[PDB]
Every structure is written in structure tokens, then in C-alpha cells.
Amino acid sequence: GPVVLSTPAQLIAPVVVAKGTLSITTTEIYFEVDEDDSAFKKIDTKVLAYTEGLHGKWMFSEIRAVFSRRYLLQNTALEVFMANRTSVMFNFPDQATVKKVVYSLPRVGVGTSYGLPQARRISLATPRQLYKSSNMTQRWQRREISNFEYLMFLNTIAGRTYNDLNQYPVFPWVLTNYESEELDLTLPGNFRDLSKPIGALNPKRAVFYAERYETWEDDQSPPYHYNTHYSTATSTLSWLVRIEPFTTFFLNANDGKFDHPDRTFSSVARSWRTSQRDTSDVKELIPEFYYLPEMFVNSNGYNLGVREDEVVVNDVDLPPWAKKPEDFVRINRMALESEFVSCQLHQWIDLIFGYKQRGPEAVRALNVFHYLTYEGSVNLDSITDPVLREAMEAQIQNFGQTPSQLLIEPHPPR
């Protein structure tokens, strides 16, 4: 019907980004891909099958929340959340268009669970603002909210999302013991020091980072401890290799065949080693590690004959105290909600969204990353030469994007 608004847009989905044309009527949102687009043609159909929205229609009545989102460090994207708990994300040309879209959409605000007013102002508000005006921190302390729910709140507000592997949500490793036969959730030694970054846990390697920070000499390259992030598409694809369409996506992006078993996520205990040994590995976990068994198993069908030489990915090997996936996730989420984590989580938050994210305290905390990572870092619009901008966007996706800082004061303990 009445097309109240129309604008070029970009569908931001788990494994697909496609240029299309958003159109907003008086009751729905429509999106059609540019099936003629060169880049879009080279997209595997299998992948397109898992991608919703390419020709979607969203009922205004179904809208429940509208979040301001940044695509590749640029505050020009939006993410709408549907009543059926699903969500869609489009990236527009300018923050200016976003505003038009936000004002031409229902006044769902940012939802209602966070305790923020249902106003278009909120949808556009900033991360630090949203945090400030929310009651979640209290409820979290008051135990009305679980550690998992709280960490999801922070990540959502910080702009993290399941629709962009470059800004996936971020969760901390909670346990350090993945060797033992049993796991005693009351024995401190089994828990990770939630006050230190991954790169600071092992003093042996920690030295390499402090040393490298000290003996720094360069131009336009502020000193940094890690050239590797704790959250990136690459990382995310590795953790979700056993799930479509990530699997296929990776494969297509890998000459059609998997990667050497010793490099692909194969062992939960082995990953933790690498995250303590490797100088380039400072990875942090993902939400799933606390609720999605699938992620740890080969869900392929049967009688599909492949083990001839054809590389194949089998079940992730769990720690002895974890018989089957359902077990690992159960126990892990239990540890995440344990009392130990509860009384330290604020410190980890400080490193990720807190006052130790960037600055004097960030350097004293051994928590400094490549400057091109932090918010504000770059302005793709400034780059005028396409081949130049692209190369830049390519780098952002390679280094990763630090979550938006939510507070510049020490986060309150639970």
C-alpha cells in the first residue's frame, strides 16, 4: 500500500550481506535483494536458503524493539526485533536515513525488559546512555536476572548481535579445567581469573605482551598488546563450524573443503591451551558455549559416504567430566551462574565494556588492542577511493571490533 518510505539498504545476516531496497509502508517493512548484483550472484544457494529476509515482509504489529546498530564501526545500521523472538538487521547509507526509518516505524523503543522508556529517542540513544538509564544492573545484583541474562543485556546494548559475525556477542571463559575426570564447582582453581584479559592469565606469555608494549617504536600505530582480538567473524565461524550455514559458508570460502583438523575447532580442552600458549590466540567465548549443544556435534545425515580422504569434521571432544554435549553445556552454564563468577564478573565487565576497556587503566590492565578496533576508530566515508575503502573494511573485519564501552566508572560488584 502507501509506501511511506523507501531507501537503498543492506541486509546484514549471519552469513550474508546483500544490497537491496528497503520500503516502509504504514503497517509493514519490505526488503528485496538486487538479484542482479554481481557479488550477490556468487553467493551459494545453500547459504541463501538459511538466510531470511532477502524477500521478507515484517508486520508492524510484530515489531517489538528497535536498536541502533553500527556496521563495521560506522553508526549507520538498525536491528529490529520481532515478537517471535527473531530479529533482522539492515545497514543504511547514513545515520540520517536510520532516523527516518526509526521515526517511520512503531514506537516499540528498545523493548520493555530493560526498564527503558518506549520512545524513538531510546532506539537512537547511545550505548552509554542506554546503560545509564536501565535497571538491569540493579536487578542483576538483586538476583532477579542471571549472569547469563545480564551478560546478554550488556552485549545487546554494546551493539553486539547474532546478525553480524563481526560484532558477535562476547562471553568469558569461566572454567580452566578441561582435563580432570570430575569438575568440582567449589574449587577456586577450576575458575578463570575474571579480572584479567586472556593475554594476562599466563604470566609466562604475559611477559611477551608487556615487553612488546614497552619496547614500542612506530608511527600512527599506538602501542598495543594484541594484534589478535577476542571476538571476530573468523573466530565465530570456527566455533560454529558444525552448524549450517556457517559450515557451508566456510567451505565455499575455503576452496570447497574443510581445514586441517588441528586448526579447526576440534577440542574444547585444546582450545583453552591455545588461548594460553599461542601469542596470537587471545580468543574469548561465545554465548552458545552455555546453551547450544548442537554446536559440539556433527549433525550431518547418514549414509552420505565421505570418509575416503575427503576431509570431515567430527564431534568436538569434551572434557572427561562431560559425557555428552548436553552435559558440557549444562555444567558450563552452572559454573557461569556459580557464586564464584557472580562475585568477580564485574571485573571482567570492566575489561570488556567497563573503564578498563580503553585508556590508562586499559594499559595498566594489560588490556590494550589495535587502535583500529575501538569505536570511533575510523570513518569509511572519509575514504573516497572505493578500492581504498574496501581494503579498509577488509581490515576491520580482520582485526575485529571492540564492543562499545558502556561505562567509564568501575562496575558495581554483584
In the complex, the residues that contact a copy of itself under the rule CB under 8 A are: 45-46, 49-50, 65, 81, 83-85, 87, 111-114, 142-144, 146, 149, 152-153, 155-156, 160-162, 169, 244, 287, 291-292, 294, 297-307, 312, 314-315
Residue 155 or 271 having the CB closest to a copy of itself: 155
Q: Which is nearer to a copy of itself, 140 or 209 (CB)?
A: 140
CB of 322 to a copy of itself, least distance (A): 12
- Angstrom distance (rounded) from CA 397 to CA 393: 6
Residue 12 and residue 246 in contact, taking contact as beta carbons nearer than 8 Å: no
Return the number of the residue (40 or 50) whose C-beta is nearest a copy of itself.
Answer: 50
- We find the least distance from the C-beta atom of residue 101 to a copy of itself, in angstroms, to be 19
Q: State the minimum distance, in angstroms, from the CB of residue 323 to a copy of itself.
A: 8
Compare residues 185 and 292 and give the one whose CB is closer to a copy of itself. 292
Q: State the minimum distance, in angstroms, from the CB of residue 299 to a copy of itself.
A: 5
Nearer to a copy of itself, 134 or 228 (CB): 134
Of residues 314 and 379, the one with the C-beta less far from a copy of itself: 314
Task: CB nearer to a copy of itself: give 158 or 368.
Answer: 158
CB of 67 to a copy of itself, least distance (A): 8
> Phi-psi region for residue 72, left (φ > 0), alpha (ψ -120 to 50) or beta?
left
Residue 68 Cα distances to 7, 78, 95, 244, angstroms? 17, 5, 9, 28
* Least spacing, CB of residue 34 vs a copy of itself, in Å: 20
Nearer to a copy of itself among residue 227 and residue 298 (C-beta):
298
Backbone angles phi, psi at 112, to 5 degrees: -150, -15
Q: Which residue lies nearer to a copy of itself by CB, 5 or 297? A: 297
CB of 308: closest distance to a copy of itself in angstroms? 8
Q: Which residues contact 246 (CB under 8 A, 6 or more apart)?
A: 14, 15, 236, 237, 240
For residue 385, the minimal CB distance to a copy of itself (Å) is: 37
Q: How far is the CB of 270 from a copy of itself (least distance, A)?
A: 18
In whole angstroms, how far apart are CA 256 and each of 23, 45, 293, 299, 301?
36, 14, 26, 19, 19
The minimum distance between CB 105 and a copy of itself, in angstroms, equals 14
What does residue 229 show for φ and ψ, rounded to 5 degrees?
-95, 180
Nearer to a copy of itself, 112 or 254 (CB): 112
Q: Which CB atom, from 278 or from 294, has the smaller least distance to a copy of itself? A: 294
CB of residue 408 to a copy of itself, shortest distance in Å: 24
> CA-to-CA distance for 321 and 331, rounded, in angstroms?
9
